[PDB]
Subunit: 388 residues, 2 copies
Amino acid sequence: MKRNPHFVSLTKNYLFADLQKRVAQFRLENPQHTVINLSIGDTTQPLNASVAEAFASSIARLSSPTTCRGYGPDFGLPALRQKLSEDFYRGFVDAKEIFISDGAKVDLFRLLSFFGPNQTVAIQDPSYPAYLDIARLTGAKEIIALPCLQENAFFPEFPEDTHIDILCLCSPNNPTGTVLNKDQLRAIVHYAIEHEILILFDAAYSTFISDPSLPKSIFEIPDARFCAIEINSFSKPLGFAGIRLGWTVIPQELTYADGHFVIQDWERFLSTTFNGASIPAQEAGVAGLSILPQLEAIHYYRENSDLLRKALLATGFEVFGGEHAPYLWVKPTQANISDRDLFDFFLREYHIAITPGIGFGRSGSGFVRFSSLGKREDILAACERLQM
Amino acid sequence: MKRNPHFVSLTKNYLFADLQKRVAQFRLENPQHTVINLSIGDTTQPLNASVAEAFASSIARLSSPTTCRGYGPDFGLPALRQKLSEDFYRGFVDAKEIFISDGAKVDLFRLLSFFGPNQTVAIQDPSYPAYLDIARLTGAKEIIALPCLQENAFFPEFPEDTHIDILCLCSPNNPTGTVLNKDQLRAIVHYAIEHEILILFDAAYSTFISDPSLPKSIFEIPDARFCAIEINSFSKPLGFAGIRLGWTVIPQELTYADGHFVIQDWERFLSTTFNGASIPAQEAGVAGLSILPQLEAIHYYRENSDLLRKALLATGFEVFGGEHAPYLWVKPTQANISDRDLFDFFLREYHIAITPGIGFGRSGSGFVRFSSLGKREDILAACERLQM
């Protein structure tokens, strides 16, 4: 066997692994300098109680002799496909267009592998680092970075006459924490149809959206069904620890250049390469959809975000995002801390670990990403250090 | 987007779907002719009780605030990797060589996609139909069918000076129900090393092996670590309904032509494209490994198989396999029932649905596959019809 060449292009980093070992390093050499890590995370948040109950009840069902498979589909439990259609998508998407998977990282990889090698793929800049790697691994001819800058309300800057096959969009965005609004999405969809671009719309942070005016799905947007696919899943920090579940939406209307429907090939691809999500995870998901309006956890984290924003602004920082996603995209203004300086700057001046914007790509230059997903104690501490 | 060409090569069938609709059809037009379906299946068999208990206990743990991620790896729960190493592989495989996934269909697809397009892949003939499809979908240059015939004790007939990159092996085999013994595997491994072939060894039926002399893993075979990967998982019919779990074994020693280690690239590939198996499924797996020696279910099905074999032989049928797998590979002898005749022949003469051998490939000609995975009532009925 020869080595895979699609493979040799990789180096990734890993951005967060390296930042983590560096935080550990700093902790070694600064034992009395207590560090509030906002560069990532908080796990520890437990599986929601009613979700867990449903999961166990499904297990109890599986162990009794009836029973019952249930091999799915394949495409998912009808009850989950239907509940996603109705409650999650507010009727914008039909049950038959929803394909249940075990999560949004696998799905992106399945989708990019489904579309094949030699595609040119555009991604927002700053970029979700996972995307570039999957793009390279699935054999992209080129990756085109699309500057999203606050001066443009984060609308991606499309390159003049450059061929794009796939546009990956993450909204709410990692790292900017911003959301493309209805007007912005309408223009992007119009742009995509005009240039024969397929949109992969990653909406995994959509539960974080906090004004009901904003779109939650790209299928709220005129003409999206002729050029877009959505991927989504439950947010672990919101209480889905242990639930391996996601979904992909393929509109009935979406076609290849020759008029073949994407959905028919996707169905065949999935059947050939995939066994379905587990029955208990799916039944847990049905119960998850029910408590999604409730969720005290979302409120807890929006509080974290508001707490952070105020401190940051009061210290003369410029703050973007954080309203509709668990990230704040933060610009000093300035003391001209260079890109290679930023991480040490925040550690040394505030004992706060962040992720420097530049690790996310060139348009991250000058910025830092704050994670809102942490204990209230750590957030409050962080606000003290900034208030000094 | 243009259509995927790797895709347009597909037609598969589906062999079992078509056979099923035909059994339903026959049931329509023959209401008083009761049909014993041995062409597939029996699901309904419930999740093992101690496995279910472990699963629920993991859920209870996830819902309590500690807690605790647990993102894995990535490569799997240390307790499961270690228990597979020690109990499942009897020490033949180290924990660090075992990569936990959500199942053996996904893993085959991951592996073939990991090795890349344009490979030439050899598969046993008669073939596990799923393999050909994944091979085509991942971009194989050619698929080479390897006749496995009873005259040769089912040893695959390798083609004279023909370039092979990957050899897929399924042992115990679907559809022949036979097992390649230590001597046969030793020769295949020697052949593979000499021709620079990588073996993908699918051992998903290995729990069915009933003499402790036979190898259960290819890593019992001299020199296998220089040319082989194993894939495996729990058998659903044995009591793992609802458990989305498999594993891949990459030996530390395995290298590409240039001397790079496969295991290092596999680790990177998996991290980039995969989030891990669910924690509850893995903890359930640990408990599954414990009861694997016990398993009344294996005994139940071996009984089914012995029952079938006797009836078949007493009716002058030639029977192969069935000792170490839940399939019997059966030859009339003859009444010269053509290949297109066989399914109707068994339905009409015995009210037994089987899968004709020819659906599995050219070397299936003249044979029929019996499934041993059914209720004792249906097996006994089937034996009556054959005893006439």
